[PDB]
């Protein structure tokens, strides 16, 4: 289960929000880098989760 936020992690506004598959964060497709022109088909891991994974490795 997961409880996702109602506002974009970048701009803090609501609307069409892509939900991260690994945390509660959500993002507008246009608030990502690069702005997404499609909704990913499979698993999508947000920038903050990507950073978290990286940090665990750099410390392990």
């Amino acid at each position: 289960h997961m409880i996702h936020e109602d506002f974009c992690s970048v701009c803090r506004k609501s609307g069409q929000l892509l939900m991260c598959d690994t945390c509660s964060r959500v993002y507008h497709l246009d608030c990502l880098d690069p702005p997404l022109k499609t909704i990913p088909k499979g698993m999508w891991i947000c920038p903050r989760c990507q950073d978290q994974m990286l940090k665990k490795e750099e410390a392990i």
Binding site: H4, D6, F7, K13, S14, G15, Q16, L17, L18, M19, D21, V26, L29, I39, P40, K41, G42, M43, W44
Partner: peptide, 10 residues
């Protein structure tokens, strides 16, 4: 991945 439509008030 999935999206949702949410409309918070202004």
């Amino acid at each position: 991945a999935r999206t949702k439509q949410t409309a918070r008030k202004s």
